[PDB]
Design a protein around this motif. Structure first.
Motif, PDB file in Angstrom:
ATOM      1  N   UNK B  72      11.684  31.112 110.710  1.00  0.00           N
ATOM      2  CA  UNK B  72      11.878  29.935 109.880  1.00  0.00           C
ATOM      3  C   UNK B  72      12.436  30.214 108.484  1.00  0.00           C
ATOM      4  N   UNK B  73      12.033  31.352 107.918  1.00  0.00           N
ATOM      5  CA  UNK B  73      12.521  31.793 106.626  1.00  0.00           C
ATOM      6  C   UNK B  73      14.006  32.175 106.645  1.00  0.00           C
ATOM      7  N   UNK B  74      14.466  32.961 107.630  1.00  0.00           N
ATOM      8  CA  UNK B  74      15.884  33.250 107.831  1.00  0.00           C
ATOM      9  C   UNK B  74      16.759  32.008 107.834  1.00  0.00           C
ATOM     10  N   UNK B  75      16.392  30.929 108.516  1.00  0.00           N
ATOM     11  CA  UNK B  75      17.163  29.691 108.536  1.00  0.00           C
ATOM     12  C   UNK B  75      17.178  29.009 107.180  1.00  0.00           C
ATOM     13  N   UNK B  76      16.116  29.053 106.368  1.00  0.00           N
ATOM     14  CA  UNK B  76      16.126  28.469 105.024  1.00  0.00           C
ATOM     15  C   UNK B  76      17.067  29.220 104.087  1.00  0.00           C
ATOM     16  N   UNK B  77      17.013  30.532 104.237  1.00  0.00           N
ATOM     17  CA  UNK B  77      17.831  31.471 103.502  1.00  0.00           C
ATOM     18  C   UNK B  77      19.309  31.517 103.870  1.00  0.00           C
ATOM     19  N   UNK B  78      19.568  31.458 105.178  1.00  0.00           N
ATOM     20  CA  UNK B  78      20.885  31.617 105.764  1.00  0.00           C
ATOM     21  C   UNK B  78      21.249  30.361 106.555  1.00  0.00           C
ATOM     22  N   UNK B  79      20.690  30.098 107.716  1.00  0.00           N
ATOM     23  CA  UNK B  79      21.059  28.921 108.461  1.00  0.00           C
ATOM     24  C   UNK B  79      21.049  29.346 109.911  1.00  0.00           C
ATOM     25  N   UNK B  80      21.538  28.490 110.798  1.00  0.00           N
ATOM     26  CA  UNK B  80      21.444  28.785 112.214  1.00  0.00           C
ATOM     27  C   UNK B  80      22.652  28.140 112.849  1.00  0.00           C
ATOM     28  N   UNK B  81      23.058  28.763 113.934  1.00  0.00           N
ATOM     29  CA  UNK B  81      24.196  28.325 114.726  1.00  0.00           C
ATOM     30  C   UNK B  81      23.681  27.533 115.922  1.00  0.00           C
ATOM     31  N   UNK B  82      24.571  26.705 116.464  1.00  0.00           N
ATOM     32  CA  UNK B  82      24.310  25.975 117.674  1.00  0.00           C
ATOM     33  C   UNK B  82      24.038  26.924 118.805  1.00  0.00           C
ATOM     34  N   UNK B  83      23.265  26.488 119.799  1.00  0.00           N
ATOM     35  CA  UNK B  83      22.920  27.335 120.920  1.00  0.00           C
ATOM     36  C   UNK B  83      24.150  27.711 121.726  1.00  0.00           C
ATOM     37  N   UNK B  84      25.053  26.753 121.798  1.00  0.00           N
ATOM     38  CA  UNK B  84      26.354  26.918 122.427  1.00  0.00           C
ATOM     39  C   UNK B  84      27.207  28.042 121.924  1.00  0.00           C
ATOM     40  N   UNK B  85      27.221  28.187 120.602  1.00  0.00           N
ATOM     41  CA  UNK B  85      28.088  29.163 120.034  1.00  0.00           C
ATOM     42  C   UNK B  85      27.379  30.493 120.101  1.00  0.00           C
ATOM     43  N   UNK B  86      26.039  30.515 120.151  1.00  0.00           N
ATOM     44  CA  UNK B  86      25.305  31.759 120.234  1.00  0.00           C
ATOM     45  C   UNK B  86      24.286  31.622 121.381  1.00  0.00           C
ATOM     46  N   UNK B  87      24.695  31.640 122.684  1.00  0.00           N
ATOM     47  CA  UNK B  87      23.787  31.373 123.803  1.00  0.00           C
ATOM     48  C   UNK B  87      22.674  32.431 123.985  1.00  0.00           C
ATOM     49  N   UNK B 108      15.516  24.052 104.129  1.00  0.00           N
ATOM     50  CA  UNK B 108      15.150  24.349 102.748  1.00  0.00           C
ATOM     51  C   UNK B 108      13.907  25.186 102.546  1.00  0.00           C
ATOM     52  N   UNK B 109      13.032  25.383 103.532  1.00  0.00           N
ATOM     53  CA  UNK B 109      11.832  26.148 103.301  1.00  0.00           C
ATOM     54  C   UNK B 109      10.937  26.161 104.515  1.00  0.00           C
ATOM     55  N   UNK B 110       9.821  26.854 104.363  1.00  0.00           N
ATOM     56  CA  UNK B 110       8.870  27.038 105.421  1.00  0.00           C
ATOM     57  C   UNK B 110       7.534  26.719 104.755  1.00  0.00           C
ATOM     58  N   UNK B 111       6.672  25.927 105.397  1.00  0.00           N
ATOM     59  CA  UNK B 111       5.309  25.700 104.943  1.00  0.00           C
ATOM     60  C   UNK B 111       4.319  26.095 106.012  1.00  0.00           C
ATOM     61  N   UNK B 112       3.117  26.478 105.609  1.00  0.00           N
ATOM     62  CA  UNK B 112       2.067  26.763 106.545  1.00  0.00           C
ATOM     63  C   UNK B 112       1.059  25.612 106.491  1.00  0.00           C
ATOM     64  N   UNK B 113       0.538  25.242 107.661  1.00  0.00           N
ATOM     65  CA  UNK B 113      -0.536  24.267 107.801  1.00  0.00           C
ATOM     66  C   UNK B 113      -1.832  25.017 107.468  1.00  0.00           C
ATOM     67  N   UNK B 114      -2.773  24.321 106.804  1.00  0.00           N
ATOM     68  CA  UNK B 114      -4.038  24.916 106.496  1.00  0.00           C
ATOM     69  C   UNK B 114      -4.708  25.207 107.824  1.00  0.00           C
TER      70      UNK B 114
END
Lengths: 5, 212
Positions: B72-87, B108-114
């Motif tokens: 989850x942190x990598x995607x806030x920091x960088x982002x993610x590709x569609x499953x199609x483009x990266x199967x 934008x970020x990652x939160x933890x549930x209590x």
């Protein structure tokens, strides 16, 4: 036994 | 919050996937919370890449294990590709984000549930799908074919999955084994048991993506 995966 | 929540009815979850022999549960889990928060926030439901998180999360361990909070942190920091483009390949290989051009989405970020708090988890699920861990090693969990599962299971969490709804007596979970496991790939786990761990350790560690 059983932990992360 | 309401008595029933089911993000599939709101068109916020994609088809059930199968992780196969790769211990990539953590990446599968993290991706259903990215797919759900992008739909909640933009109105569009898309599939995103589990393979990208598996190849590119340097803190996690590819097949044989990882952390959906790290993913989850990598995607806030960088982002993610569609499953199609990266199967999904079911094998960890080189990180290829660069080669696949621009990210399809970013968070934008990652939160933890209590933790060890049922009402905290149920308030997060009423807002979006959440990543959740549980003990999935006992053959009772493995042979689940339907119904509200009450165990038997301990709290030795080993499997990350995603919670996409709840009811008066259960929490609704999307697993990444086939559509042939459980209830077309889903499991309703008993809640309200008074056990702070949750049935099978379900309230041990739960994270969600923040998107603005």
């Amino acid at each position: 036994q059983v932990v992360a995966a | 919050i309401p008595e029933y929540v089911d993000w599939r009815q709101k068109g916020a979850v994609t088809p059930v996937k199968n992780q196969g022999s790769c211990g990539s549960c953590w990446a599968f889990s993290a991706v259903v919370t990215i797919e759900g928060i992008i739909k909640i926030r933009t109105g569009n439901l898309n599939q995103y890449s589990e393979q990208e998180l598996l190849d590119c999360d340097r803190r996690s361990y590819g097949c044989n294990g990882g952390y959906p909070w790290s993913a989850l942190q990598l995607v806030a920091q960088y982002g993610i590709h569609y499953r199609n483009t990266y199967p999904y390949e079911g094998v960890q290989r080189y990180c290829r984000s660069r080669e696949k051009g621009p990210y399809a989405a970013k968070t934008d970020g990652v939160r933890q549930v209590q933790p060890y708090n049922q009402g905290a988890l149920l308030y997060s699920i009423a807002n979006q799908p959440v990543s959740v861990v549980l003990q999935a090693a006992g053959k009772d969990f493995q042979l689940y074919r339907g119904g509200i599962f009450v165990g038997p299971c301990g709290n030795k969490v080993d499997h990350a999955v995603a919670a996409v709804g709840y009811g008066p007596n259960y929490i609704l979970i999307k697993n990444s084994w086939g559509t042939g496991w459980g209830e077309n790939g889903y499991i309703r786990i008993k809640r309200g048991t008074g056990n702070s761990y949750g049935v099978c350790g379900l309230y041990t560690s739960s994270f969600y993506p923040v998107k603005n």
